[PDB]
Amino acid sequence: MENPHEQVQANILSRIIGNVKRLNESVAILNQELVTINNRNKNLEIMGAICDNYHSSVQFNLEATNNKKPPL
Amino acid sequence: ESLDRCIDDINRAVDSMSTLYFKPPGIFHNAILQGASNKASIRKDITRLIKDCNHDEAYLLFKVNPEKQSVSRRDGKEGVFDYVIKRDTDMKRNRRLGRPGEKPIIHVPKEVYLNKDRLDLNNNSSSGTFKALSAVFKDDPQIQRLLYALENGSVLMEEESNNQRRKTIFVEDFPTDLILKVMAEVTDLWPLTEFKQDYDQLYHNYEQLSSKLRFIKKEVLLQDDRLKTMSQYH
Amino acid sequence: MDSASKEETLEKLDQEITVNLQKIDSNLSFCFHKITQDIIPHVATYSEICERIMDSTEWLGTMFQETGLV
Amino acid sequence: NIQSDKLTSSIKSRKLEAEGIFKSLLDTLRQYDSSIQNLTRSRSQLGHNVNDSSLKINISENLLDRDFHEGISYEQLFPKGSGINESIKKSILKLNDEIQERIKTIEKDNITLEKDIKNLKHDINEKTQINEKLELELSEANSKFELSKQENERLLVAQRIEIEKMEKKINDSNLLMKTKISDAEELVTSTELKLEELKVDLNRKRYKLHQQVIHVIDITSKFKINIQSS
Amino acid sequence: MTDALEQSVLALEGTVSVLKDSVESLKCANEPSTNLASTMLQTKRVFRLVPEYDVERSKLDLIEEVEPLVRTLGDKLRKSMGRMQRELDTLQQTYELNDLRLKKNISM
Amino acid sequence: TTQSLLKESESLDKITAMIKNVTAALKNNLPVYVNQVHEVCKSTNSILDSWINIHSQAGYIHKLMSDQTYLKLINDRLHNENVNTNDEDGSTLHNVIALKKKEILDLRQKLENRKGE
Amino acid sequence: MNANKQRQYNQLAHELRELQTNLQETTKQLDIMSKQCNENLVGQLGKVHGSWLIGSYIYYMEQM
Amino acid sequence: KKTLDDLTAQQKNLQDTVTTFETIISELYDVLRIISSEVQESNRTETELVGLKQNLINNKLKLMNVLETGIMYKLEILQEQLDLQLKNLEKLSQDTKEESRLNDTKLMDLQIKYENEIKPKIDKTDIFIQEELISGKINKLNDEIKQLQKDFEVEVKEIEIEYSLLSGHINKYMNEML
Amino acid sequence: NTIQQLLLPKIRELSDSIITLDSNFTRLNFIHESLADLNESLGSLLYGIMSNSWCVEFSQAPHDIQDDLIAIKQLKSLEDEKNNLVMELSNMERG
Amino acid sequence: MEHNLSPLQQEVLDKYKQLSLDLKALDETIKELNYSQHRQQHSQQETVSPDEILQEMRDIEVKIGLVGTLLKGSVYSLILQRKQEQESLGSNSK
Amino acid sequence: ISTTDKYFIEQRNIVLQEINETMNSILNGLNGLNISLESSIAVGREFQSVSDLWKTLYDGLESLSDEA
Amino acid sequence: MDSIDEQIAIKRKELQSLQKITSLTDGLKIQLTELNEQIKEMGMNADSVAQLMNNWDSIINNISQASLGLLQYAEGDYEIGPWKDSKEDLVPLPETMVRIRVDGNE
């Protein structure tokens, strides 16, 4: 009566769409988490920057005067 | 008169220099400076400040928790570790709620050490061991009342008869198995070797004399039914 | 070439259409499972470690903000 | 006219001063009545219902409303024997001394209660070591029952062991009596029966030998007859 | 038809290319970070600090609370062994009673 | 005159009192004060010197670890002792510089050969 | 050709386009995340704090 | 001048009013600080003292609750159990002595039967066996057996002698026939 | 008479000198207290560092940092020589 | 010639010698306080001097900047730099 | 003026000149010491700020005795 | 029937498109795996930094624990050395503290 494969493809294609949709949703959720982390990590580099600055500054001070003692 | 007034002025000044007090060095000052003064001094200070514990003794007194790399007392009674670490933990949790850090960041464990070390210097009412026990056994009234009894000689238990009244029950009244189980959990809470040898000696005493006694008891029961049988016979 | 054989080729193209759709389904499902069960839990554990990181060094943070008014 | 104007100006100044001081006096009296009411409430909280009207001071709020041709004096509000320093103040110090001696009596009552309290811990303590001695005697009584009924059982069992061994010995003695009597009687009867059987056997043997003698005599007679007849 | 198919193809190609680029960039960024994290930031905690106050307090508890508890426990256990020894004597005496009664009664 | 004499006499004896007071203070209270503050500042100098020492060693370690190459060498040294820990000589820095010198001698002989070419 | 199949491919195209957009967003977020991790988490906090700790360790061990 | 006198009267009345109000105000303030710092403070101390009184009374009541329905009930029940144990050991000793006297009565009764009835009858059986049976009836039976055996044997021997005599007579008759 | 009139001024100036000395020593005591608490704070932090270092192990801390440091500068120079040499080689190959 | 001064006068004169001697004493003590050869002669104490003053205190001061001022300066530089990219972003927007 | 009185006058004059030179010396020395002490205070004034902003780590008695 | 060649052509074009889609999906698979590995190693680096960071928390606990000496001792114990007023004694160290093996090896 009708080409047997058509319905199969239909069903198969339907499944494709479904899981792809889930893919979408999954990916979207990932973005949300990712986004949150970045804002929640907006403090960390701040600390690091100061720490970096601090380290650099002390080394500069250790060249300003010759109090730099030799390593061990 | 001016010379007299200058005289009283300088007298007040000299009294003032008499009253001046310069703050003496404190604790960590002394610790770090003596631990960095001289090689003999640094060795003596590193010996005084941090003494290595006997691994046997530390194992006998403390649970060591390698998965979290923590140390706690075996009985579970809170110490300075429990107070300090729990305070740090709920500080961390409060900060996770966005609450700001507290000032000073370093807190001396004042009250916990107070309420106990002034008591030591002077040296619900049950001590820590029985409290931890009652925590560790189940809520069975028999075992809890046995604990009550051995804590104060005898337990004031309430009569099951319709005449509700309080009556005393002594330690010998509970079965020997229950008191032996109490002693077993006790020596489990204190793995110290003297207690272990006391327990295996006493439990081997039980396993010979009382277990042989129980065997003889069932056997006399059977032999006494034999006595009744022969008495009916003649 | 042939006629019965060209109908055979017609059925053939049907066949690799079908199996190609099967492969597409399988690969997309594997990608979905990879995202759901592996990548997102790793992002979550990374969040946990970053929480511990920012959490432990916070006393430096209070010391810094008490003077720098940041 | 200079004196008239000067005195009128002084009158006006003293008038405004009088209104100000009268307003201040009314405010003082009102807050005084508030304080007296508060003190009365506080005393009544202890059961001492102080009469509010006794301590309150009454001043006419329309006293200054009269014309200034009429004089106003302290004796009008507070005649002799009734001024604040005369009656009200002295009465309030008397109330203060009454409260003070009430405080002394209450402190003595508190000290008596503390002494009764210490004596009560004394009685409790005495009755408590009485209780722990009595509990010691009760535990000692349970233990003394234990070993007591137990050693009573021990000696009672000992006497019944002795009884049962000696009952067994008497049973064996009675069995020995019956066995020995039966054996002796059986031996006597067997010896008598053996004597009777031996008598019978020897008598039949005697008869047998006599019959054999008769047979021998008959044989000899027959042989003699045969020899002689030949 | 072919418009939608080619649109899907080009979309997937874009995703694949961007993913390739992001993976390559991630690898390049991670390599020095991974190298640094592997070697010197390795840290092992061997000891945990324990104040001597709690050690001496545990010793004091063991010697003045648990020690007296085990002393009274031992004394009461010795009287317990005494009581079970007694009932062993009572049980053997009931045994001799029952055995002798059996013997005499069976004998007669 | 006599009254002026008594006046100056009491002036002088009270003055003598207060100078004995000030010298007593200057011999007892002042020297111990300056000694105490001096000792405290000496201890502060020692503490800060220790701070500079740890900071200097930290800066040296930071400079050493800032190099990616040293990181590579310590990494494959770890890989090696996982492979085999006995051969310490396999992964050393002095063997590294020796092989570098061999490479440079090969380089320079290549350059001189090419110059001859 | 089957109109149902045509609409199926239309839906597929829409889904793949939104998938491409979401993946590009994820790429941006991941790149920023890598920047925080490699440049700050190990770049500055890790390096500086390890320097402090190891230097103090060496200093105190030399004074055993 | 009349206005001057009237205004002077007004001024003196004003001055008297002002000084009266001032002295009343001063007295009011003085007695007010008396009330606040002395009378009201004394009442506050009195209230604190009666609060201490109530605390002491509550402690007293609680200590009597610990005493009768607590400690005295404990003494009552402890004495009840002790007295129970005391009548119990009384009845225990009573039963012990009753069964002890029953037991020793039983044993000495059966021992008396053993020693004064069993033992004499054993001795009687013994002498009856030896003196009367063994040395007597059994011995006389054996003696009669031996005597009868001797009589039978001598009769048998005489019978055999008769046999021999008859045989000899036959042998002699054999020669006499010649 | 003039003797006491000339005694008065040097007593006055001695008095002002001594009272200003009193004030100076007061502020000195204040500074000393500030320095003492500063010492205590830094000493507490240092003692924490020391206690932690006496219970933790860092398996990859070098020992001969002198040799490592001279070696890394020498190596960095050698790579610089490598870059200029290879640049010259490529330049002559291109030309 | 033996000067026959009045004996209140003589006692006052002895007051002058005794006051003289103890002012020399106080001068000696203050000289000791300001004495600059501390530990340079036979002695073991320290005198108020650059040993405890400007020489000493600036030696502490040059190191104290490591903990106090440098820490604040680090965050101050961070704030300045943050304002720097804020201005840069504003310029990019404009 | 009597000869003994005149001698006593010259004696006071000489000794008072000695007091004058001595007090000049004392005031010079005291002024020097005081200026040095002022300089020490001036250099030490800065330490108060750093001490305060570093007490936030561990103060002890400032907070411990606060609970007392 | 419909002209066969048209559907044949359509089927081969969908064939080619489908094979290309399968190839692109396999590529997506491999890239996802590589991405997850990258995220895993970044998480490992962060964990290592956390291990490096726990030392500060431990330092804070050590200081808090050892600070008990301050209220253990008394005021009269402090005047040691130059602070002894004029008219061996356990210089005031903090609360004495002990170590315990924690790595599981004794």
Numbering used by the authors:
A (entry chain Y): 1 to 72
B (entry chain a): 3 to 125, 155 to 265
C (entry chain b): 1 to 70
D (entry chain F): 434 to 663
E (entry chain d): 1 to 108
F (entry chain V): 60 to 176
G (entry chain c): 1 to 64
H (entry chain G): 270 to 447
What does the paper say about this structure?
Knl1c functions in the spindle-assembly checkpoint (SAC), whereas Ndc80c, a heterotetramer of Ndc80, Nuf2, Spc24 and Spc25, is the major microtubule-binding component of KMN. Many fungi, including S. cerevisiae, utilize the ten-subunit Dam1 complex (Dam1c), which self-assembles into a large ring around microtubules, whereas most metazoans contain the Ska complex. Here we describe the cryo-electron microscopy structure of the budding yeast outer kinetochore Ndc80 and Dam1 ring complexes assembled onto microtubules.
Our structure is consistent with previous cross-linking mass spectrometry and insertion mutagenesis experiments indicating that the central segment of the Ndc80:Nuf2 coiled-coils proximal to the conserved Ndc80 loop directly interacts with the Spc34:Spc19 C-termini. Mutation of a series of four conserved interfacial residues on Ndc80 (Ndc80CC-mut1&2) did not impair viability, consistent with in vitro observations that disruption of this interface by phosphorylation of Spc34 at Thr199 exerts a minor reduction in outer kinetochore – microtubule rupture forces. In contrast, the Ndc80CC-mut2 (Spc19:Spc34-Ndc80:Nuf2 coiled-coil contact-2) essentially had no effect on rupture strength when combined with Dam1c. Our molecular models therefore account for two EC-sensitive contacts: the Dam1C-ter-Ndc80cCH and the Spc34-Ndc80:Nuf2CC interfaces. At both, residues phosphorylated in EC would cause electrostatic and steric repulsion, explaining how EC-mediated phosphorylation suppresses kinetochoreDam1c:Ndc80c assembly.
